[PDB]
Design a protein around this ligand. Sequence first.
Ligand SMILES: NC(=O)c1ccc[n+]([C@@H]2O[C@H](COP(=O)([O-])OP(=O)(O)OC[C@H]3O[C@@H](n4cnc5c(N)ncnc54)[C@H](OP(=O)(O)O)[C@@H]3O)[C@@H](O)[C@H]2O)c1
Ligand SMILES: CCc1nc(N)nc(N)c1OCCCOc1ccccc1CCS(=O)(=O)NC(C)=O
Length: 166
Amino acid sequence: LVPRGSHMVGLIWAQATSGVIGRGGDIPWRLPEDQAHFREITMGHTIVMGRRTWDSLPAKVRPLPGRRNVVLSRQADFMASGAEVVGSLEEALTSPETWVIGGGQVYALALPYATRCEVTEVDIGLPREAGDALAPVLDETWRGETGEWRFSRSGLRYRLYSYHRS
Ligand SMILES: NC(=O)c1ccc[n+]([C@@H]2O[C@H](COP(=O)([O-])OP(=O)(O)OC[C@H]3O[C@@H](n4cnc5c(N)ncnc54)[C@H](OP(=O)(O)O)[C@@H]3O)[C@@H](O)[C@H]2O)c1
Ligand SMILES: CCc1nc(N)nc(N)c1OCCCOc1ccccc1CCS(=O)(=O)NC(C)=O
């Protein structure tokens, strides 16, 4: 759907109902259904992540396979084997389609350029706590479809939102 001369930027994240996406350097739930969803959307694309999200990736999927991994860091000497490290968002968003995959800092940086958000809401009542990474706030310029609740294999409930804007 994307003309090759354009620059589509999308954000994709999974959040608790409270907006928590990250805590203690990790994602504070386990949801294989969301991993599969994230993989289906991002496979084959350039993905952009902050350095702390690179650190948070399980070693088995660091780099995330089948995607061009781009890591934003101000550390010139940062070691991200199998990825590329860029010092600015400008060098990160050169592809016709980019998926920004976290974390809290980088979603805030990228949201003003984005025209798609793919959001998984996890029906888990984790209260926001000091130091948590949080999902970005979407204003009224965004619109989209809210999916139905589904139970994961474990009985954890989740639903998918597909948002877009002009
Ligand atoms: N639930 C989800 O969908 C999801 C997805 C992804 C991540 N997470 C979780 O979110 C947390 C990580 O989020 P976070 O907000 O703490 O960190 P982050 O956004 O992943 O990374 C922050 C790092 O990115 C670099 N950075 C930020 N802005 C930059 C800029 N303008 N230019 C160059 N570099 C920049 C800096 O790296 P340097 O310090 O190296 O300079 C900064 O420390 C983890 O808990 C992770 O597991 C959740
Ligand atoms: C899955 C978490 C997540 N969900 C959404 N909706 N958006 C995100 N940005 C997001 O974070 C992505 C970075 C953390 O990714 C993971 C963390 C723990 C386990 C597995 C993966 C992915 C591995 S995968 O499914 O992409 N690839 C293979 C080969 O498993």
